[PDB]
Each structure stands twice: as C-alpha cells, then as structure tokens.
C-alpha cells in the first residue's frame, strides 16, 4: 500500500533509455499504466516491448504541438487521462558562450523549457477535473549550480523550476502537485561521452565517489508520484551524491 | 518485496510517543525495520513498546542528557547490534519575540534541537562506518529556511541542523552513510495545536495546499530517505510543506 | 573620491526610459559612468538623452530584434569604445493563469526576458575579456525564486536568468568579468501600478517592510555590483525585496 | 551622499585584524562613529590607534553577558546608542566529527551563534525606539556549503542565518534591517594556517582564481549598512569569487 500507483495513468517523455527508461519501468512496477515516448516509431515499439501489458510506447516530439495533441488523444482513448506526467525528454547543445549559436540556444529553450509549458498545460485540465494529479520535471544539478559551457542548458533547467513553483501555486488547492527531481551526474549516454580526465574531474566533485544510477532517479520520481507525497509541491528533490547541497 | 525494504535494519527514532515521531516509527516498522522509539517518560516508552509489539521497543531518553544518550545507545547495541538508521525527531519550542526572549529559552532550544543532533549523530557514527552503510535523517522545519517572528531560537536551531547535516554528509559519504534533513511545514500535532484560532486560520492561508500536513506525510519522506533506494541523496533538505515555501 | 567610482566606464542600461532602469541609469551617471540608456521609442531615447545630458545618451533598442542589438552596440563601440558594464533591465509581463496562457504570451516572455540576456551578454563579452574587466548585472525578480500564480512564464524566464548567470559567471571569472543578478521585490513602477486595489493591499501584506520598494533602491544594488569594490561577487543573486522572501 | 553613514554609531565586534579591521576602517571612512572590539585591553588600544577621532576600541568578550552590558553602556555614554551592529567576532574549533570534543562544539555555539542572539537583543531596543537600524552578521560560505571537519562552525554559521531571517521578520516594520554577509575564503590569519596543498585545493574551487581580500567583505558590509540598503532584509550577500552560487 506504500507507494502504490495502481489505477494511475503515467506519461514519461523520452523513455527509450537511461533515466527515462528507468522511470517508466519503476512506475509500471508500482502499478501504473505507463506510456513512454521516443522520437521514432521504432523507439516507441522498443518501449512497448519492455512495458508489455503494463502500458505502451508512443512516438512524441515535445517541440511539436500537433504531436503533443495526437499523443494525448491516443492516451485518453486507450488508457484515460494522464494522472502523472514526467517531463524527462531533454537534450544538450553545449558550447562556451563565445561559440554558442542562436540555434543551440533556441533548440535548448524549445526542447527543455517550452516543452514543459506545453505538456503541463495539456494535461492539467484532466487533473483539475479529477482534483488529483502529479507533474514531475526532470531537472539537473546544473540548473542550480551552473556549469561552464552549458549556459543554455542551465537556463532551461533553472527556468523549469521557476515554472514549477508558479504552477504549483496555481493548482495546489485542486489536489495537483508539481515538483522537480534534479539529478547529479548519472551514468547514461549523456555521460559515457565525457573523456577520462573529465570523468575523473566530475567524480572528484562528488562526496559519494561515484556517478548515480538511472534507477536512483527513478526511485525519487516514483516517490513524488505517490499518494504519500501529496504534501510536497513546488519542491526540488536533489539526487546528486552530494555534488551540490542546497 | 525488496522495494523500500528495511528488513535487517535497526532504527532509532527519538520522540516517538506522539506526533511526527510516532508516525515515523510506525512506518519504519511497517517497512521491516527493528524500531526503537523514545519518549521522555516511562509511560510513553511503554506506549511505544505497546504499539510496536514484535517490531521493536520503547525506551526513555532525554536528548539533552549525555548519560541518557549513552545508556539508551548501549541498550540498543547490547540487544539489537546498534543503530543503522537514526531519525533525530525530538524537538521543542520556546517561542517569544526577541525582546522578551529569556536566556533559558535560547539555551533550552539550542540544547534540545541542535546540540542533540551533534551528540546522537556522533554516537551512532562509528558503528555505521564499520558496516559501511547508514542513514541519519534529521527532522528540521520550514521555519529554519523561512524564518518566523517569535521563533528566532527555533529557527536558528533548525537552520543549524542543516549546516551540520551538510558538513557531516561531506565527511561520511564515501563510507556509505547518507545524512539528510526532512523539513516539514505545519503538521497536525500537539505543537501546531498550540496556535489560537486566528493564528491557525492565518497559517492555513499561507499554505497553497490549504490544509495542514499529516504526520504520515513526514513519515513517508523519512522512510524514503532511510531506504536503500536513496543512497545517492545526501546533504539534502527535503521540504514537505504544501507549498508554504519553495526552494 | 575613488569609492564606488565608475569614472572611465561605459554602461549600457536597457529600458532606461522609466522605472527601475531610469533610476539605474541616473545613479550610474552620478557615480561617473558614461551611460547609454535605451527605450523602445525615439521619444523615450531622446528623453534619456535629455536627463543624462553630458553624462551619456539615449538610443532606441528592441532587445527581441538582433539587428537592433547589433546596431546599438556598434553605435556604442564606434563612439564610446564599447561596453564595460551591461545592465539587462528591459523586461515585460504577459500574465495569465496557465490554463489561459497563450503560446504568444509564453514566447513573448522567453524572447524579451530570457533570450535577450543571452544575446546582449554574448555581444558584449569579447570586449570585456579583451580588457580583462567587466560587469554584467541582470535584473531578475523575487518571482523567479518564489514563483507566483498567473506568472509561470515570467517566473520561468526570471529563474532562467539565474541559471544563465551562474554558468556565464563560471566561464568568465578568471578573466576579470563578474556576472550577477539583482532580484527586486515589488517596486513602485508602471508594472506594479498594474495591480488593482485589493491585489496591491494583499501584496503589501506579504512584505515585512510594509511598503513597496523604490526604483532607487534597486539602482543602489546594481551600482554596488557594478563597482570595482564588488570584484569578488560573482554568480550571486542579490535580493532586494523588503523581506517578501528570504533565501 | 551615496553610502553616507555620517551621524551613525557602529559597533564592529572583533575589529583587531583581518575582516573586522577592514570593516571598522571602511565604516569610519563613510562617516560613522565606530567602536571596534578586541578580547584584550591592548587589542582595544590598537583599535583606538587606527580609528583616531573616528571612534574608539573597547575590550569585549561576546560570550560574557556582563562584558556585553558594560560595553554597550560605555558606548551609550560616550557616543549614544548603537545604530549599526556588525557581528564579526567568531572562531573555529575544527575536527572531524569522530574527534570533535564537547567543548569544541560548545565553544563554537557560544562564540559564533549565541553571541549573535545576545548582542542583537541588547542593541534592538534603541534601534526600535528610533525606528531605524542595521544589524549585519558576518557568516561564511561554509554555513551554506558545509565543510568536512567544520560541522560545528557550519552549524553555527547556518544558525545565524535562521536567526537573522526570524529577527528580520519581527523588526522590519520598525525600520530595522537584519542581514548576513557570507565571505568565501579570505586572506587572513584563519587562512595563512592552511598548508600549500590545502591552499591550492581551496583556490581550485574558486572561479575567480584567488582568495578574497578583507576590504571586499568590508565593502559588502558597508553597503548593507547604508540608507540605500533599506529594502534589503533577511538576505545573505555571498562574497566568495564564485566558490558557491546560490
Ligand atoms: N544523464 C545525466 O547525467 C543527467 C543528469 C541530470 C539531468 N538529466 C536530465 O535527464 C533527462 C534524461 O536524460 P538522459 O541522460 O537519460 O538522456 P538521453 O539518454 O539522451 O535520453 C533522452 C530522451 O529524450 C528523448 N528526446 C530528445 N528530444 C526529444 C524531443 N524533441 N521530443 C521527445 N523526446 C525527445 C530521446 O528520444 P530518442 O530515444 O528517440 O532519441 C530520449 O528518450 C534529461 O532531461 C536530462 O537533461 C540527465
Ligand atoms: N508543525 C509541526 O508539528 C512541525 C513542523 C516542522 C517541524 N517539526 C519538528 O518535528 C519534530 C516532532 O514534532 P511534533 O510536532 O511531532 O512534536 P510533539 O508532538 O511536541 O512531539 C515531540 C516529541 O519529542 C519528544 N521530546 C521532547 N523533548 C524531548 C527531549 N528533551 N528528549 C527526548 N525527547 C523529547 C517528546 O517526548 P514526550 O512525549 O515524552 O514529551 C515527543 O515524543 C520536532 O523536531 C519539531 O520541531 C514539527
Ligand atoms: N515590481 C517591479 O516593478 C519589478 C519587480 C521585479 C523585477 N522587475 C524587473 O525590473 C525590470 C524593469 O521593470 P520596471 O518595473 O521598471 O518596468 P517598466 O516600468 O515597465 O519599464 C520597462 C522598461 O523596459 C523597456 N522595454 C520593454 N520592452 C522592451 C523591449 N522589447 N526592448 C527593449 N526595451 C524594452 C521599456 O521601454 P519603453 O519605455 O520604451 O516601453 C522600459 O524602459 C524588468 O526586467 C522587470 O521584470 C520589476
Ligand atoms: N578568514 C576567512 O576566510 C573567513 C571566511 C568566512 C567567514 N569568516 C568569518 O569572519 C569573521 C572574522 O574572521 P577573520 O578571518 O578576520 O578572523 P580573525 O582573524 O581570527 O579575528 C577574529 C576576531 O574576533 C575576536 N574574537 C574571538 N573571540 C572573541 C570573543 N569571545 N569575544 C569577542 N571577540 C572575539 C578576535 O579578538 P582578538 O583579536 O582579541 O583575538 C578577533 O578580533 C568570523 O566570524 C569568521 O568566522 C572568515
């Protein structure tokens, strides 16, 4: 009965690998009907393969309003309205400011910040009608700490928290909570990229002495998604091994 | 199952006779922990024994008395093998505007709400290091982060809990121990039930959720941080306040 | 004297026709800076020229238009040698509850309040690096830290300003440039004068100081961060809010 | 007229060297009548030597209520009531928790936290009568970040901020502001202590690439002390070269 999501419909954007996959799997373990998304049809099918009778994968581009609308209609049709939205889809377009292109700025705003606006708005009417809901944004320690060469990504991840706090204020009295989980450096395809010196240097900033695991983010998201977290709203739950302490 | 499972862990929860501490103790027992809850009185310690049953026991502890701390921890070590999860929940208020605040109101709070965290945390740390696994969870307050008129002593102690938590977290992270604070908003307990009708109405007006929190809601946050699943969370303050304050 | 002295520095203050930006511009000129203040209109740009007199000049700038940015910065470089102190003050609101919020209300805010900071900051940075000295000061808002119903777009932009500020600060600190945000509470300007009587009363009730702030009070904080005396402050948010929020 | 303190009486605790000396000197430059303190009579005289006709040094132990009372009476007698209180006096008693003595804990609570309570209370009646005042606490980045081997110091410096916020709420409507300046690592006698590896390691955590100067803390304190900072209360002004970004 602890942390039970039976009866809830969850949408996890960008569930094909790493953190989003871990989130989608754990939410299904806890009893939710889960819809995970990828940017391609084959990616969507790979999600359906791992969810089995616990849900389905769908193709979604969170920068395209028509895609968002089609996906939410399909979910409502087959499963009913979204009770738990996890805004996990996100990208990087790293560069020092001196080298940062207009398109690198805009791609990050569109994918990592504006998406959260669009998806949150799109699921909110259903949640307000039922007087119950969860929105959980996947932020980053970089949103709080800043990082050289990621001024775009940091702006977007910080903006997500300001959005979250304001939305939380609007919807709290109607039983909807809005929160962010901010991972530190987690072992995924974003990371295996870093070279050895960079990895060693990232690790040296972590008291725990290791990168996080995707499952560790999934656990934090599942906790905030639960009935037991009803009195948490407008909050950022930092899961970073002590890399930053707020 | 093995999800949020605390089987095999020994938990000490200070001030488990009522309120938030009682809810913490009951939930940690539900999750499989062997729980020792404490009260300042023998009647409270027996009431804790009674509600825990085969899942644990109650002991009398005054967290301002080092001899009491030493005795309780020895009892726990002798029988159960010593503390894997420490929940520093015991705390009090001694409210007054600063111009009316007595030296004893200041010291009572430092001793009960802040120095207690230093003493208890130090006393359990050796055993946790040896096992390469531990959890310390301090119960802070939204007031530590926000401040509150009439509670400068309480606010200083609760803010100081976080400073301690961050420092200890940096010291012990590489040996498998996490140290974190859960900071409740206004929770329905005897401490809240203190406020008059006007003050309660005015407090509720500050909470977006439009209600006080339930002790169980703090227990859930504590149980989550106590779990194996929270091993990458350390030096963190988890705010459970209905939106009263947002960090 | 040489205390908080800005003689020899070129300051660009966006949105200096009224409100907080006007007060910033007037104070930076008082402290010795050569000030270029901007308005969206030629009448406003001339009014700025008129109040600055021999201490500076006004120019028309729309911070959402990259051609306008390029033209203004070239004018400043050609005449005055380019910007030593950038104050990103220009900003707007497009308030609505989320369920009523239009795509254009979201985009107008991202563009005016957030992307403008990226564009202007990038455009002045090369010159500041070359000189091994610079100041960028962004005007944020208490709303970026606290959130506010009806302002999710504004709050996201203002919070995003801080994320940008921290990252840029880390990039440019070792080359003599500091990057910081001043986050005002509710300040008496046309933006505040927006609120109805009930809303204004309710806003004042949230401010311990019991008044709105004055534009001059934000100008003072900006002037302090712009000074040589603030060289060890970077990546910081200086809150000027009468106690409305406390971090 | 900018940052003018003419007519104000300032008490700076622990003004014999480093940060406190810099604070006392700058406040006097800006026109305040300054009383700086040391723990000895010779220390007090050294303060009187540098202040000259701008003020005086006094012997004060901020852990002793009778000393506090005597010092405030002497100030009221000679200068009038304290308008600006700068709580700068502070010590370290470093140790890993495993080695931390009860006396090392208590000395830090008494000197660094309880002192702020006692002095603040003692100056507040005068400030509330006049409907104008400034209290500025000298915190530490360690209060916000934490630091291994300084759990006592971090507790005390963090507690100072919770105290400050609560006091600010009580006194704001009567024209008194209460704030903290949180230095990063500043070149003083606290620091020259660190060995070369430790210095190098501290510096590597600072984007600015240098330790701060005492004058840099003095400037921040003088700004908060000014009439121009009337709308700042309950705030922490971080002066740390980017070592931590809040
Ligand atoms: N990895 C880390 O250390 C780390 C740390 C902190 C925060 N985060 C945050 O965690 C989230 C997931 O990160 P991750 O490391 O697991 O990333 P990942 O491995 O790169 O996966 C990203 C996911 O987002 C999807 N996606 C990208 N653009 C999209 C778009 N326009 N519309 C819909 N979906 C899109 C991808 O779809 P496809 O599979 O079809 O490409 C993919 O499933 C991101 O928000 C990230 O910023 C990550
Ligand atoms: N709204 C809230 O209630 C709220 C909000 C935020 C934070 N908190 C914090 O949450 C914690 C629990 O509060 P609560 O509301 O549940 O309080 P409560 O109902 O007053 O319960 C206090 C508990 O602490 C014990 N205790 C008190 N002094 C002690 C001492 N010197 N030594 C050992 N135990 C002692 C009490 O034992 P006895 O039963 O024997 O007296 C009791 O079990 C406290 O740290 C409090 O500051 C409360
Ligand atoms: N309570 C407050 O007033 C408050 C609180 C916190 C933060 N702030 C922030 O403080 C800043 C100044 O606000 P305020 O209250 O003084 O505002 P205001 O009175 O509305 O003044 C706005 C200024 O920005 C200029 N501006 C607007 N849009 C622009 C654009 N697209 N390009 C270039 N300039 C543009 C305006 O030019 P025109 O005169 O030509 O229209 C004007 O000079 C804003 O960033 C605001 O978000 C205000
Ligand atoms: N140095 C740093 O990097 C640094 C960084 C962050 C924050 N801080 C904080 O800044 C403040 C000043 O530090 P600092 O580095 O300049 O220190 P310092 O060089 O050690 O000077 C400390 C001052 O406090 C006085 N003092 C000590 N105990 C006292 C007591 N019981 N009663 C009255 N006065 C007492 C000393 O008096 P005597 O001269 O008579 O001994 C001295 O004037 C402290 O609060 C410190 O925690 C320092």
What is the biggest distance separating any 2 CA atoms in chain D, rounded to whole angstroms? 53
Q: Please count the CA atoms within 13 angstroms of the CA of D183 that sit on its side-chain side.
A: 25
Give me the helices (H) in chain D, please: 18-29, 41-51, 65-78, 102-109, 115-130, 141-145, 151-171, 189-192, 196-204, 214-225
- The distance of B215 to chain C (nearest Cα, Å) reads 26
Q: Is D221 in the pocket of ligand 4 (CB under 6 A)?
A: no
C215 — phi, psi (to 5°)? -50, -35
Give distance in angstroms: CA of A190 to centre of ligand 1.
Answer: 8
Distance from C-alpha of B204 to C-alpha of B210, rounded to nearest angstrom: 6
The residue assigned the tokens 């009567």 is D174
Entry resolution (Å): 1.6
* Interface membership of D236 toward C (CB under 8 Å): yes
- Residue (of C161, C178, C183) closest to C116 by Cα position: C161
The residue assigned the tokens 């009468």 is C242
D186 — phi, psi (to 5°)? -115, 140
The method recorded for this entry reads X-ray
A186 — phi, psi (to 5°)? -115, 140
Q: In 3-state terms, what secondary structure has residue A138?
A: strand
Q: Is the dihedral of CA D47, D49, D54, D59 positive or negative?
A: positive
Beta bridge partners, D183, equal D239
How far CA B235 is from CA of B90, C162, D28, D154, in Å, comes to 20, 22, 41, 13
Domains assigned to chain A: 1-246 (3.40.50.720)
Q: In 3-state terms, what secondary structure has residue A56?
A: strand
Distance from C-alpha of A82 to C-alpha of C218, rounded to nearest angstrom: 44
Answer whether C219's CB lies under 8 Å from C27's CB.
yes
Ranges assigned E (strand) in A119-175: 133-138
How far CA C107 is from CA of A61, A225, B208, C183, D23, in Å, comes to 18, 29, 27, 22, 46
Residue C142 in tokens: 């208490």
Distance from C-alpha of C64 to C-alpha of C182, rounded to nearest angstrom: 21
Answer whether A178's CB lies under 8 Å from C109's CB.
no
DSSP D211: P
The residue assigned the tokens 């004055």 is C214
Q: Quickly list DSSP for C174-224.
A: GGTEEEEEEEE-SBSSTTTTTS-HHHHHHHHHT-TT-SPBPHHHHHHHHHH
The neighbours of chain A, by the rule of 3 or more Cβ pairs under 8 Å, are B, C, D
Cα angle for residues B22, B220, A19 (degrees, 5° grid) = 160
Kindly list the strands in the beta sheet with A55-59, ordered across the sheet, starting from the edge strand earlier in the chain. A55-59, A33-38, A9-12, A84-87, A133-138, A176-183, A236-239
Distance from C-alpha of A227 to C-alpha of B3, rounded to nearest angstrom: 16
Give distance in angstroms: CA of C103 to centre of ligand 3.
Answer: 21
Q: Is the dihedral of CA B198, B200, B201, B202 positive or negative?
A: positive
- Residue (of A108, A88, A119) closest to A12 by Cα position: A88
Beta bridge partners, A138, equal A181
- Testing ligand 4's pocket by substitution, the residue of D11, D25, D39, D63 carrying the most ligand atoms inside 8 A of its CB is D39
Number of residues that this document lists for chain B: 247
Residue D133 in tokens: 């005042």
- The distance of B107 to chain D (nearest Cα, Å) reads 8
Distance from C-alpha of B136 to C-alpha of B120, rounded to nearest angstrom: 10
Beta bridge partners, B237, equal B181
Cα angle for residues B202, A164, C241 (degrees, 5° grid) = 55
Which one of C146, C147, C246 has the shortest CB-CB distance to B147? C246
Query: Chain B contacts of A29, Cβ < 8 Å?
Result: 3
Chain-centroid distance of CA C17 in Å reads 13
Question: Which residue on chain D is closest to B173 by alpha carbon?
Answer: D148
What number of other Cβ atoms are within 10 A of residue C100's Cβ?
A: 10
Q: Please count the CA atoms within 13 angstroms of the CA of B247 that sit on its side-chain side.
A: 20
D220 contact partners, CB below 8 Å, separation of at least 6: C230, C233, D181, D237, D239
| Pairing mode of beta strands D236-239, C177-184 | unpaired
Q: Quickly list DSSP for C64-130.
A: T-HHHHHHHHHHHHHHH---SEEEE---------GGG--HHHHHHHIIIIIIHHHHHHHHHHHHHHH
DSSP D186: B
Query: Chain C contacts of A246, Cβ < 8 Å?
Result: none
C27 contact partners, CB below 8 Å, separation of at least 6: C216, C219, C220, C222, C223, D2
Q: Is the dihedral of CA D37, D165, B140, D205 positive or negative?
A: negative
- Testing ligand 3's pocket by substitution, the residue of C16, C45, C90, C242 carrying the most ligand atoms inside 8 A of its CB is C90
Answer whether B134's CB lies under 8 Å from B85's CB.
yes
Residue D68 in tokens: 């506090």
Q: Is D71 in the pocket of ligand 4 (CB under 6 A)?
A: no
């Amino acid at each position: 009965q602890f942390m039970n999501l039976e009866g809830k419909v969850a949408l996890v954007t960008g569930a094909s690998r790493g953190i989003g996959k871990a989130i989608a799997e754990l939410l299904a373990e806890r009893g939710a009907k889960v819809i995970g998304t990828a940017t391609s049809e084959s990616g969507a099918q790979a999600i359906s393969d791992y969810l089995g009778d616990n849900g389905k994968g769908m193709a979604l581009n969170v920068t395209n309003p028509e895609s968002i609308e089609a996906v939410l209609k399909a979910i409502t049709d087959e499963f009913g309205g979204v009770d738990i939205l996890v805004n996990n889809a996100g990208i990087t377009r790293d560069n020092l400011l001196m080298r940062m292109k207009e398109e690198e700025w805009s791609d990050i705003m569109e994918t990592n910040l504006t998406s959260i606006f669009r998806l949150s708005k799109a699921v909110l009417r259903g949640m307000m009608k039922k007087r119950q809901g969860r929105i959980i944004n996947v932020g980053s320690v970089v949103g709080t700490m800043g990082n050289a060469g990621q001024a775009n990504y940091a702006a977007a991840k910080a903006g997500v928290i300001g959005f979250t706090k304001s939305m939380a204020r609007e919807v709290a009295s109607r039983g909807v909570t809005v929160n962010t989980v901010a991972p530190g450096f987690i072992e995924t395809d974003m990371t295996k990229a870093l070279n050895d010196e960079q990895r060693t240097a990232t690790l040296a900033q972590v008291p725990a002495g290791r990168l996080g695991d995707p499952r560790e983010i999934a656990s934090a998201v599942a906790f905030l998604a639960s009935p037991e977290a009803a009195y948490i709203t407008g909050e950022t739950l930092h899961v970073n091994g002590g890399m930053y302490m707020i």
